[PDB]
Amino acid sequence: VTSKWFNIDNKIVDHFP
Amino acid sequence: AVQQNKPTRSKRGMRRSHDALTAVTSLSVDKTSGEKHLRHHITADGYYRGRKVIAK
Amino acid sequence: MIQEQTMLNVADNSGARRVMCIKVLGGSHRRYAGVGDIIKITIKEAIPRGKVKKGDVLKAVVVRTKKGVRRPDGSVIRFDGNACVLLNNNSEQPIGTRIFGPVTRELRSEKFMKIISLAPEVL
Amino acid sequence: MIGLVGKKVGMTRIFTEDGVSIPVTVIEVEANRVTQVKDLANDGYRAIQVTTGAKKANRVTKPEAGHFAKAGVEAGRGLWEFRLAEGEEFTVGQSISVELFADVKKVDVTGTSKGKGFAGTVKRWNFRTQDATHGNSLSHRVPGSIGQNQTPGKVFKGKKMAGQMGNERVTVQSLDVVRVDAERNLLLVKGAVPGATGSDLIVKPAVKA
Amino acid sequence: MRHRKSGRQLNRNSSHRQAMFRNMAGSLVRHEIIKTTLPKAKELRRVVEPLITLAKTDSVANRRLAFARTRDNEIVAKLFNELGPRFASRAGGYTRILKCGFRAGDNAPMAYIELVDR
Amino acid sequence: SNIIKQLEQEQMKQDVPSFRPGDTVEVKVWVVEGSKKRLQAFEGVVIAIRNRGLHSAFTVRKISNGEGVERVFQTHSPVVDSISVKRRGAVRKAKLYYLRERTGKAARIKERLN
RNA sequence: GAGGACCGAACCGACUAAUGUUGAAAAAUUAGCGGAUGACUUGUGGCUGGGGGUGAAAGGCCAAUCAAACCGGGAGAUAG
RNA sequence: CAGGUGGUCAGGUAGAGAAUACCAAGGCGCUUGAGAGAACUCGGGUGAAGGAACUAGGCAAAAUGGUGCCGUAACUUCGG
RNA sequence: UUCCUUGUCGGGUAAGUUCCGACCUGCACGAAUGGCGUAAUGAUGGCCAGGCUGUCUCCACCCGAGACUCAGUGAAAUUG
RNA sequence: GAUGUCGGCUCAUCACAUCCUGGGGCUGAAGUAGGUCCCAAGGGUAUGGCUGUUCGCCAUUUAAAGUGGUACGCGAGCUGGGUUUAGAACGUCGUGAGACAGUUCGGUCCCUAUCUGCCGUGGGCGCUGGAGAACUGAGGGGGGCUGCUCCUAGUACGAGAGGACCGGAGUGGACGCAUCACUGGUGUUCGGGUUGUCAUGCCAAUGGCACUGCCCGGUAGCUAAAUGCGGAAGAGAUAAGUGCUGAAAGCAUCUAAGCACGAAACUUGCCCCGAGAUGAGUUCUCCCUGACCCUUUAAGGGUCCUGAAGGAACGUUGAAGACGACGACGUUGAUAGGCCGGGUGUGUAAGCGCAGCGAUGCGUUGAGCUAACCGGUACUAAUGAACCGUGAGGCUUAACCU
Ligand SMILES: N[C@@H](Cc1c[nH]c2ccccc12)C(=O)O
Ligand SMILES: [K+]
Ligand SMILES: [K+]
Ligand SMILES: [K+]
Ligand SMILES: [K+]
Ligand SMILES: [K+]
Ligand SMILES: [K+]
Ligand SMILES: [K+]
Ligand SMILES: [K+]
Ligand SMILES: [K+]
Ligand SMILES: [K+]
Ligand SMILES: [K+]
Ligand SMILES: [K+]
Ligand SMILES: [K+]
Ligand SMILES: [K+]
Ligand SMILES: [K+]
Ligand SMILES: [K+]
Ligand SMILES: [K+]
Ligand SMILES: [K+]
Ligand SMILES: [K+]
Ligand SMILES: [K+]
Ligand SMILES: [K+]
Ligand SMILES: [K+]
Ligand SMILES: [K+]
Ligand SMILES: [K+]
Ligand SMILES: [K+]
Ligand SMILES: [K+]
Ligand SMILES: [K+]
Ligand SMILES: [K+]
Ligand SMILES: [K+]
Ligand SMILES: [K+]
Ligand SMILES: [K+]
Ligand SMILES: [K+]
Ligand SMILES: [K+]
Ligand SMILES: [Mg+2]
Ligand SMILES: [Mg+2]
Ligand SMILES: [Mg+2]
Ligand SMILES: [Mg+2]
Ligand SMILES: [Mg+2]
Ligand SMILES: [Mg+2]
Ligand SMILES: [Mg+2]
Ligand SMILES: [Mg+2]
Ligand SMILES: [Mg+2]
Ligand SMILES: [Mg+2]
Ligand SMILES: [Mg+2]
Ligand SMILES: [Mg+2]
Ligand SMILES: [Mg+2]
Ligand SMILES: [Mg+2]
Ligand SMILES: [Mg+2]
Ligand SMILES: [Mg+2]
Ligand SMILES: [Mg+2]
Ligand SMILES: [Mg+2]
Ligand SMILES: [Mg+2]
Ligand SMILES: [Mg+2]
Ligand SMILES: [Mg+2]
Ligand SMILES: [Mg+2]
Ligand SMILES: [Mg+2]
Ligand SMILES: [Mg+2]
Ligand SMILES: [Mg+2]
Ligand SMILES: [Mg+2]
Ligand SMILES: [Mg+2]
Ligand SMILES: [Mg+2]
Ligand SMILES: [Mg+2]
Ligand SMILES: [Mg+2]
Ligand SMILES: [Mg+2]
Ligand SMILES: [Mg+2]
Ligand SMILES: [Mg+2]
Ligand SMILES: [Mg+2]
Ligand SMILES: [Mg+2]
Ligand SMILES: [Mg+2]
Ligand SMILES: [Mg+2]
Ligand SMILES: [Mg+2]
Ligand SMILES: [Mg+2]
Ligand SMILES: [Mg+2]
Ligand SMILES: [Mg+2]
Ligand SMILES: [Mg+2]
Ligand SMILES: [Mg+2]
Ligand SMILES: [Mg+2]
Ligand SMILES: [Mg+2]
Ligand SMILES: [Mg+2]
Ligand SMILES: [Mg+2]
Ligand SMILES: [Mg+2]
Ligand SMILES: [Mg+2]
Ligand SMILES: [Mg+2]
Ligand SMILES: [Mg+2]
Ligand SMILES: [Mg+2]
Ligand SMILES: [Mg+2]
Ligand SMILES: [Mg+2]
Ligand SMILES: [Mg+2]
Ligand SMILES: [Mg+2]
Ligand SMILES: [Mg+2]
Ligand SMILES: [Mg+2]
Ligand SMILES: [Mg+2]
Ligand SMILES: [Mg+2]
Ligand SMILES: [Mg+2]
Ligand SMILES: [Mg+2]
Ligand SMILES: [Mg+2]
Ligand SMILES: [Mg+2]
Ligand SMILES: [Mg+2]
Ligand SMILES: [Mg+2]
């Protein structure tokens, strides 16, 4: 199955650039 | 939110300490049929408080 | 029940037509100004050759409100619009010489006895 | 000084000749029957215990009935106590009526508020609501934050939260006594008192000035 | 809050409730005893008993008033010809609720509601 | 409450005339200008009436000096000295609130005449 | 009676907000929104194949996969 | 499984209409119900006085809305 | 496109780091990787006004679907 | 093998290096108004224009618009303007792919709470025979803000200008509690107007649907913008400070002995919770006054008879309520519905008659209808029972009667 969308979403995931 | 540790079988039985059913204690006798029924309810034979209320 | 951004009609002949309340004076976090309360205003519209010009920052006293006033027996006196009378910034005395329309008896004080005298009718 | 047990009849107005309308609450104060006197020797404090009203004789238990028979009174709808000052004296069976307040100018009225049930923080504690628009997500009347972060890492006691509102004892202080009518057992106080119509009220003299 | 209010919503909207008690009031007049849930039988007393007192005086204006509330000419004819004359000297209390079993499909508490002289 | 309705019946006026919405009514109120007492007249159209016994009230609307003024009188108030009907009006409604948006010839009211 | 003309349903689309986010749905619903005789839209069949196609060009699309598809093999690639 | 799926048929009253409202022929009430009438969430209705003071931003809501006739400015590629 | 910079002056507002007009000291514009204008057009960016409003001051009440209770069926992420 | 970022919103809590209010010393302190230092954390401590802003500048207020800590408090509480992915363009750098704490337009924010915590609300058992009430108060919580005007008094002070301390009265702002008599909002359960269409055979009269079809009024309840009330006074011990008497030190000295003043801070006074206060308290009232057997002979077990005071259950329900709980009533009865009378709201029903060609008007008629309201009334439903709860309540010591 595909992963949870919130784990895909760049805004949520990449929060600490 | 979800648990961090698996609750025990003891904590599961403590929560269900209030889940018990309470039996009915009031089975009344009809004064002409002698049948049991709930109070303020008609009997299975259609009697209530001594008289035939429903002719079924 | 006047607050900031409320537009008022003018009930004297100073030259203004519409004024906007920009502050309700007399306390911190004070919300409303009923009949007889001093407000700080700005002039939004005026006549070509009046005593005041558009853009002045003055004081005014509220003389009529649509919300109305209450009397000791329980009565109410409401009007159709809100009206005020311009005052000077420092002395707080009327600028105009005539008053238009009725006023009420909440203005009956030593501060505003010149408005009560010029008024066509006091309710 | 002692008080009386009354009953909220409702509100009305009293017109003055000057044309001032006074909002009044009508309190029906029937005679209060003293049923027990407490003293320092037997009880450690001085107080009287009064009853008022009437009660159906089939609803009076045997324990309660024997307490009234010992005093010599007829059963009322309850029992209340009043702490005595020093110099005030009463006897069991004595009846106290509304003319006690003939010269009292201000009273305190105690009653049980009206019940509002489970109430939210906006109604119970006057919280502000959040935006109705501008992107808000299911958070129009919620309480917001309830704490800090890792320090202290807990919610403090007495935090204002949703819960049961109303239905509790409340006292309103320093109400003017407008009229004391002894032949119809009335007392007219200016203003609103806690409780619904038909509730029990305890009317004391004002402790303050 | 709910203080001092009367009437049951019964998990329906306003028009569904009005149409349901108009059907249930015609069935109680027609068959003179029906079986329904206990909360619905108690709300039916405030619909059918006012109709029986309206039928206790016969007039063209009362027939049209009972027709606007039942919309069934067979029910209006029985109200003003039989039920009116029957209850002509009874002051209210035309119906009687008898509690019976719980319903098998959803454990709902049932009750019979009949007319008093059936 | 037989208690409260008996306390109110002893305060109610006994000769308040009969008027209905649409009527032109002149009310005379007591005013106190410092130390002396006089009567002043408020004449207008009755646009609303509240029948609540001692708590009765009625609204009167009039155009004074170019401004519309509405005045709610408490009927059994001793500030209201006397009510008198000047003209009877023919209207179909109990509340004439639609007269707030009308004025001039559009706010005329037919006379009842019977 | 012309028009990549105008208003506007079917039909084609997808600008805003709210809901939903272990959904009714692995991209939708509701209320509004754009085109609507044309560089339009649609049925059936056919052709172009992976360093290749096709692209009014966004590394877009090529079977829910794309800065090199999928399947099998070299293969137990190699992994300080 | 509230999604997708080409063609044909096309009644009445109002209406320009295949829009929309109510209906005919016809077909359905959507495979958990019964109560209660708390907070809070969702979809809506109304609101005293004020009227953008809200906010990043009039977001969202509210408002306008038809036919006939009168009348209509700058600018213009003379069509608007 | 301008770092210094919210440049300076004027307009609009009671008050304007945004907007409009101008100045030229163009860090670091400029002529078909076009320059400067431009009627009409745009679910395009910025600003202002009228109307309108629960956006707000400051929330109140009501109508439905959940939440709550009862009967039937009956999950999930996580977990030394 | 993840501890989500700036600002805003919401909700806060602590420190004191005190912004206001309170108490003082010095002043180059006449008065009014200040300057500076000391004590004091009880309460209070802005709204807007610009900008993503924090900040800042400006406008206008205020008694004042405090400084900081709390993951620069708070995204399993909200937002997503800014920053910080993928599109595109400008200036600039690079031959170029591209790059820039340079700028510009656009750009998916999940979680049904197991534990701790907190806000509410119940069940069990205990408190030593059982039960029904009324209390005491160990302890805990809430509250504590302040303006202006007038009198004192144009007095004290001052050349004049100006202009008080102390004390008293009135009236406001913000905040809180209660309430619905008034003024109002709501009022899809009450009355009416009206558009389109369908039906009840048709006319007349009605009903369904169209957001409650669209609207106009409005009862009860709930409620604020409505209207009542509150912050205190007083007492105790103090801070900084001021003293009296007084030696050490023949003087002087508020201190060493002794004695007195002194603030919104502390303890009380005001309001609410409260005996699980296991240290489980007190007072009043009510109820129970039977036999036998056995073992392991003791706070022992069992059988027969007995079933109290009271409680629970069931029913009719409530200004009480998510469910429990709490309150009222159950025929010796007004608990709910109905019914009767009234009130209130709407605004002159239907039918009939008259006038008019007709739409329509007038009379009967302030008519008809009227929810949750008020006062009454056993017509309907609240049943005779049954169920739980027992049968005199341990030991030791002391004081009393025997
Ligand atoms: N959150 C949305 C849209 C979404 C689908 N897939 C995603 C992947 C990444 C971010 C968002 C999404 C949904 O669950 O329907
Ligand atoms: K509150
Ligand atoms: K053409
Ligand atoms: K055509
Ligand atoms: K084709
Ligand atoms: K390849
Ligand atoms: K595939
Ligand atoms: K509920
Ligand atoms: K440049
Ligand atoms: K200017
Ligand atoms: K300017
Ligand atoms: K160009
Ligand atoms: K566009
Ligand atoms: K443009
Ligand atoms: K802080
Ligand atoms: K300190
Ligand atoms: K200060
Ligand atoms: K000083
Ligand atoms: K403080
Ligand atoms: K800055
Ligand atoms: K944030
Ligand atoms: K967290
Ligand atoms: K988020
Ligand atoms: K834990
Ligand atoms: K305290
Ligand atoms: K009213
Ligand atoms: K009301
Ligand atoms: K119709
Ligand atoms: K309406
Ligand atoms: K000395
Ligand atoms: K004070
Ligand atoms: K105890
Ligand atoms: K008639
Ligand atoms: K009437
Ligand atoms: Mg509660
Ligand atoms: Mg969302
Ligand atoms: Mg929402
Ligand atoms: Mg810790
Ligand atoms: Mg349901
Ligand atoms: Mg409908
Ligand atoms: Mg076209
Ligand atoms: Mg496309
Ligand atoms: Mg869309
Ligand atoms: Mg759509
Ligand atoms: Mg279009
Ligand atoms: Mg079109
Ligand atoms: Mg379209
Ligand atoms: Mg073409
Ligand atoms: Mg694909
Ligand atoms: Mg490759
Ligand atoms: Mg390998
Ligand atoms: Mg190999
Ligand atoms: Mg399907
Ligand atoms: Mg299709
Ligand atoms: Mg259609
Ligand atoms: Mg059919
Ligand atoms: Mg109930
Ligand atoms: Mg609801
Ligand atoms: Mg409004
Ligand atoms: Mg309005
Ligand atoms: Mg703004
Ligand atoms: Mg703002
Ligand atoms: Mg919009
Ligand atoms: Mg022009
Ligand atoms: Mg032209
Ligand atoms: Mg033209
Ligand atoms: Mg400028
Ligand atoms: Mg802005
Ligand atoms: Mg420019
Ligand atoms: Mg260039
Ligand atoms: Mg160049
Ligand atoms: Mg070139
Ligand atoms: Mg150009
Ligand atoms: Mg286009
Ligand atoms: Mg279940
Ligand atoms: Mg599992
Ligand atoms: Mg795991
Ligand atoms: Mg880990
Ligand atoms: Mg200090
Ligand atoms: Mg602006
Ligand atoms: Mg932080
Ligand atoms: Mg957090
Ligand atoms: Mg956004
Ligand atoms: Mg952004
Ligand atoms: Mg890019
Ligand atoms: Mg960078
Ligand atoms: Mg987008
Ligand atoms: Mg969220
Ligand atoms: Mg749990
Ligand atoms: Mg205490
Ligand atoms: Mg305390
Ligand atoms: Mg009203
Ligand atoms: Mg209204
Ligand atoms: Mg309404
Ligand atoms: Mg007809
Ligand atoms: Mg139909
Ligand atoms: Mg239909
Ligand atoms: Mg009322
Ligand atoms: Mg006790
Ligand atoms: Mg009786």
PDB file of all heavy atoms in Angstrom, chain J residues 184-187 217-219, ligand 92:
ATOM      1  P     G J 184     -39.369  48.066  23.387  1.00  0.00           P
ATOM      2  OP1   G J 184     -39.935  48.952  22.359  1.00  0.00           O
ATOM      3  OP2   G J 184     -40.177  47.008  24.007  1.00  0.00           O
ATOM      4  O5'   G J 184     -38.092  47.402  22.730  1.00  0.00           O
ATOM      5  C5'   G J 184     -38.081  46.059  22.291  1.00  0.00           C
ATOM      6  C4'   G J 184     -36.666  45.609  22.079  1.00  0.00           C
ATOM      7  O4'   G J 184     -36.012  45.441  23.358  1.00  0.00           O
ATOM      8  C3'   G J 184     -36.479  44.264  21.411  1.00  0.00           C
ATOM      9  O3'   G J 184     -36.637  44.332  20.014  1.00  0.00           O
ATOM     10  C2'   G J 184     -35.078  43.875  21.845  1.00  0.00           C
ATOM     11  O2'   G J 184     -34.100  44.571  21.095  1.00  0.00           O
ATOM     12  C1'   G J 184     -35.062  44.404  23.271  1.00  0.00           C
ATOM     13  N9    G J 184     -35.419  43.364  24.250  1.00  0.00           N
ATOM     14  C8    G J 184     -36.543  43.340  25.028  1.00  0.00           C
ATOM     15  N7    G J 184     -36.575  42.322  25.817  1.00  0.00           N
ATOM     16  C5    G J 184     -35.409  41.631  25.549  1.00  0.00           C
ATOM     17  C6    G J 184     -34.906  40.437  26.099  1.00  0.00           C
ATOM     18  O6    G J 184     -35.401  39.729  26.953  1.00  0.00           O
ATOM     19  N1    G J 184     -33.699  40.089  25.535  1.00  0.00           N
ATOM     20  C2    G J 184     -33.046  40.786  24.563  1.00  0.00           C
ATOM     21  N2    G J 184     -31.886  40.274  24.161  1.00  0.00           N
ATOM     22  N3    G J 184     -33.496  41.901  24.042  1.00  0.00           N
ATOM     23  C4    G J 184     -34.677  42.262  24.577  1.00  0.00           C
ATOM     24  P     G J 185     -37.101  43.049  19.193  1.00  0.00           P
ATOM     25  OP1   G J 185     -37.404  43.444  17.821  1.00  0.00           O
ATOM     26  OP2   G J 185     -38.099  42.354  20.019  1.00  0.00           O
ATOM     27  O5'   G J 185     -35.835  42.096  19.210  1.00  0.00           O
ATOM     28  C5'   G J 185     -34.671  42.357  18.439  1.00  0.00           C
ATOM     29  C4'   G J 185     -33.698  41.223  18.585  1.00  0.00           C
ATOM     30  O4'   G J 185     -33.355  41.077  19.984  1.00  0.00           O
ATOM     31  C3'   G J 185     -34.233  39.854  18.208  1.00  0.00           C
ATOM     32  O3'   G J 185     -34.190  39.600  16.820  1.00  0.00           O
ATOM     33  C2'   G J 185     -33.374  38.909  19.027  1.00  0.00           C
ATOM     34  O2'   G J 185     -32.119  38.715  18.393  1.00  0.00           O
ATOM     35  C1'   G J 185     -33.181  39.714  20.308  1.00  0.00           C
ATOM     36  N9    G J 185     -34.154  39.367  21.375  1.00  0.00           N
ATOM     37  C8    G J 185     -35.287  40.065  21.718  1.00  0.00           C
ATOM     38  N7    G J 185     -35.955  39.541  22.697  1.00  0.00           N
ATOM     39  C5    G J 185     -35.250  38.406  23.035  1.00  0.00           C
ATOM     40  C6    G J 185     -35.477  37.415  24.031  1.00  0.00           C
ATOM     41  O6    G J 185     -36.362  37.317  24.865  1.00  0.00           O
ATOM     42  N1    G J 185     -34.509  36.438  24.027  1.00  0.00           N
ATOM     43  C2    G J 185     -33.439  36.409  23.179  1.00  0.00           C
ATOM     44  N2    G J 185     -32.611  35.379  23.318  1.00  0.00           N
ATOM     45  N3    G J 185     -33.212  37.318  22.257  1.00  0.00           N
ATOM     46  C4    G J 185     -34.155  38.274  22.215  1.00  0.00           C
ATOM     47  P     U J 186     -35.382  38.802  16.125  1.00  0.00           P
ATOM     48  OP1   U J 186     -35.188  38.821  14.675  1.00  0.00           O
ATOM     49  OP2   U J 186     -36.623  39.300  16.742  1.00  0.00           O
ATOM     50  O5'   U J 186     -35.176  37.303  16.606  1.00  0.00           O
ATOM     51  C5'   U J 186     -33.992  36.572  16.309  1.00  0.00           C
ATOM     52  C4'   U J 186     -33.920  35.318  17.134  1.00  0.00           C
ATOM     53  O4'   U J 186     -33.951  35.682  18.534  1.00  0.00           O
ATOM     54  C3'   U J 186     -35.103  34.383  16.957  1.00  0.00           C
ATOM     55  O3'   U J 186     -34.896  33.496  15.868  1.00  0.00           O
ATOM     56  C2'   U J 186     -35.214  33.679  18.303  1.00  0.00           C
ATOM     57  O2'   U J 186     -34.371  32.548  18.373  1.00  0.00           O
ATOM     58  C1'   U J 186     -34.715  34.753  19.270  1.00  0.00           C
ATOM     59  N1    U J 186     -35.804  35.481  19.972  1.00  0.00           N
ATOM     60  C2    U J 186     -36.310  34.919  21.121  1.00  0.00           C
ATOM     61  O2    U J 186     -35.903  33.892  21.594  1.00  0.00           O
ATOM     62  N3    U J 186     -37.293  35.630  21.731  1.00  0.00           N
ATOM     63  C4    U J 186     -37.838  36.804  21.311  1.00  0.00           C
ATOM     64  O4    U J 186     -38.710  37.308  21.984  1.00  0.00           O
ATOM     65  C5    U J 186     -37.294  37.324  20.106  1.00  0.00           C
ATOM     66  C6    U J 186     -36.320  36.665  19.492  1.00  0.00           C
ATOM     67  P     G J 187     -36.079  33.148  14.852  1.00  0.00           P
ATOM     68  OP1   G J 187     -35.653  32.102  13.919  1.00  0.00           O
ATOM     69  OP2   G J 187     -36.553  34.409  14.272  1.00  0.00           O
ATOM     70  O5'   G J 187     -37.210  32.556  15.792  1.00  0.00           O
ATOM     71  C5'   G J 187     -37.146  31.217  16.266  1.00  0.00           C
ATOM     72  C4'   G J 187     -38.079  30.999  17.426  1.00  0.00           C
ATOM     73  O4'   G J 187     -37.858  32.024  18.432  1.00  0.00           O
ATOM     74  C3'   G J 187     -39.567  31.109  17.115  1.00  0.00           C
ATOM     75  O3'   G J 187     -40.095  29.935  16.507  1.00  0.00           O
ATOM     76  C2'   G J 187     -40.158  31.414  18.487  1.00  0.00           C
ATOM     77  O2'   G J 187     -40.291  30.243  19.274  1.00  0.00           O
ATOM     78  C1'   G J 187     -39.072  32.317  19.094  1.00  0.00           C
ATOM     79  N9    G J 187     -39.434  33.735  18.908  1.00  0.00           N
ATOM     80  C8    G J 187     -39.249  34.504  17.793  1.00  0.00           C
ATOM     81  N7    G J 187     -39.758  35.686  17.896  1.00  0.00           N
ATOM     82  C5    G J 187     -40.343  35.708  19.147  1.00  0.00           C
ATOM     83  C6    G J 187     -41.044  36.740  19.827  1.00  0.00           C
ATOM     84  O6    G J 187     -41.300  37.877  19.451  1.00  0.00           O
ATOM     85  N1    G J 187     -41.464  36.339  21.081  1.00  0.00           N
ATOM     86  C2    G J 187     -41.237  35.102  21.633  1.00  0.00           C
ATOM     87  N2    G J 187     -41.724  34.916  22.867  1.00  0.00           N
ATOM     88  N3    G J 187     -40.586  34.131  21.011  1.00  0.00           N
ATOM     89  C4    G J 187     -40.169  34.496  19.779  1.00  0.00           C
ATOM     90  P     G J 217     -42.312  43.242  11.198  1.00  0.00           P
ATOM     91  OP1   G J 217     -41.670  44.567  11.218  1.00  0.00           O
ATOM     92  OP2   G J 217     -41.461  42.048  11.340  1.00  0.00           O
ATOM     93  O5'   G J 217     -43.461  43.229  12.297  1.00  0.00           O
ATOM     94  C5'   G J 217     -43.377  42.411  13.449  1.00  0.00           C
ATOM     95  C4'   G J 217     -44.745  42.058  13.967  1.00  0.00           C
ATOM     96  O4'   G J 217     -45.386  41.103  13.077  1.00  0.00           O
ATOM     97  C3'   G J 217     -44.778  41.384  15.327  1.00  0.00           C
ATOM     98  O3'   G J 217     -44.682  42.324  16.394  1.00  0.00           O
ATOM     99  C2'   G J 217     -46.102  40.634  15.293  1.00  0.00           C
ATOM    100  O2'   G J 217     -47.185  41.500  15.582  1.00  0.00           O
ATOM    101  C1'   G J 217     -46.166  40.196  13.822  1.00  0.00           C
ATOM    102  N9    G J 217     -45.604  38.844  13.611  1.00  0.00           N
ATOM    103  C8    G J 217     -44.526  38.560  12.817  1.00  0.00           C
ATOM    104  N7    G J 217     -44.212  37.311  12.790  1.00  0.00           N
ATOM    105  C5    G J 217     -45.148  36.707  13.603  1.00  0.00           C
ATOM    106  C6    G J 217     -45.308  35.342  13.967  1.00  0.00           C
ATOM    107  O6    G J 217     -44.649  34.376  13.611  1.00  0.00           O
ATOM    108  N1    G J 217     -46.379  35.152  14.819  1.00  0.00           N
ATOM    109  C2    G J 217     -47.193  36.145  15.262  1.00  0.00           C
ATOM    110  N2    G J 217     -48.173  35.776  16.078  1.00  0.00           N
ATOM    111  N3    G J 217     -47.047  37.412  14.945  1.00  0.00           N
ATOM    112  C4    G J 217     -46.025  37.633  14.104  1.00  0.00           C
ATOM    113  P     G J 218     -43.651  42.103  17.602  1.00  0.00           P
ATOM    114  OP1   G J 218     -43.791  43.208  18.570  1.00  0.00           O
ATOM    115  OP2   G J 218     -42.325  41.847  17.043  1.00  0.00           O
ATOM    116  O5'   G J 218     -44.171  40.775  18.303  1.00  0.00           O
ATOM    117  C5'   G J 218     -45.354  40.756  19.089  1.00  0.00           C
ATOM    118  C4'   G J 218     -45.797  39.343  19.356  1.00  0.00           C
ATOM    119  O4'   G J 218     -45.794  38.571  18.133  1.00  0.00           O
ATOM    120  C3'   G J 218     -44.931  38.540  20.306  1.00  0.00           C
ATOM    121  O3'   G J 218     -45.235  38.824  21.657  1.00  0.00           O
ATOM    122  C2'   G J 218     -45.244  37.099  19.923  1.00  0.00           C
ATOM    123  O2'   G J 218     -46.419  36.645  20.576  1.00  0.00           O
ATOM    124  C1'   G J 218     -45.529  37.218  18.425  1.00  0.00           C
ATOM    125  N9    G J 218     -44.419  36.765  17.569  1.00  0.00           N
ATOM    126  C8    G J 218     -43.674  37.589  16.775  1.00  0.00           C
ATOM    127  N7    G J 218     -42.780  36.977  16.085  1.00  0.00           N
ATOM    128  C5    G J 218     -42.945  35.652  16.420  1.00  0.00           C
ATOM    129  C6    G J 218     -42.235  34.518  15.964  1.00  0.00           C
ATOM    130  O6    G J 218     -41.314  34.455  15.157  1.00  0.00           O
ATOM    131  N1    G J 218     -42.708  33.365  16.554  1.00  0.00           N
ATOM    132  C2    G J 218     -43.726  33.291  17.456  1.00  0.00           C
ATOM    133  N2    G J 218     -44.006  32.065  17.867  1.00  0.00           N
ATOM    134  N3    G J 218     -44.417  34.326  17.901  1.00  0.00           N
ATOM    135  C4    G J 218     -43.967  35.486  17.338  1.00  0.00           C
ATOM    136  P     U J 219     -44.233  38.422  22.833  1.00  0.00           P
ATOM    137  OP1   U J 219     -44.323  39.479  23.852  1.00  0.00           O
ATOM    138  OP2   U J 219     -42.936  38.041  22.263  1.00  0.00           O
ATOM    139  O5'   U J 219     -44.877  37.109  23.444  1.00  0.00           O
ATOM    140  C5'   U J 219     -46.237  37.073  23.832  1.00  0.00           C
ATOM    141  C4'   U J 219     -46.616  35.742  24.426  1.00  0.00           C
ATOM    142  O4'   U J 219     -46.772  34.739  23.397  1.00  0.00           O
ATOM    143  C3'   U J 219     -45.628  35.113  25.386  1.00  0.00           C
ATOM    144  O3'   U J 219     -45.662  35.710  26.663  1.00  0.00           O
ATOM    145  C2'   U J 219     -46.072  33.659  25.392  1.00  0.00           C
ATOM    146  O2'   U J 219     -47.206  33.487  26.221  1.00  0.00           O
ATOM    147  C1'   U J 219     -46.498  33.461  23.937  1.00  0.00           C
ATOM    148  N1    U J 219     -45.465  32.788  23.112  1.00  0.00           N
ATOM    149  C2    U J 219     -45.086  31.489  23.423  1.00  0.00           C
ATOM    150  O2    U J 219     -45.533  30.837  24.327  1.00  0.00           O
ATOM    151  N3    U J 219     -44.135  30.946  22.613  1.00  0.00           N
ATOM    152  C4    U J 219     -43.531  31.550  21.542  1.00  0.00           C
ATOM    153  O4    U J 219     -42.695  30.932  20.898  1.00  0.00           O
ATOM    154  C5    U J 219     -43.966  32.886  21.282  1.00  0.00           C
ATOM    155  C6    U J 219     -44.887  33.446  22.055  1.00  0.00           C
TER     156        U J 219
HETATM  157 MG    MG K  92     -40.016  41.694  20.630  1.00  0.00          MG
END
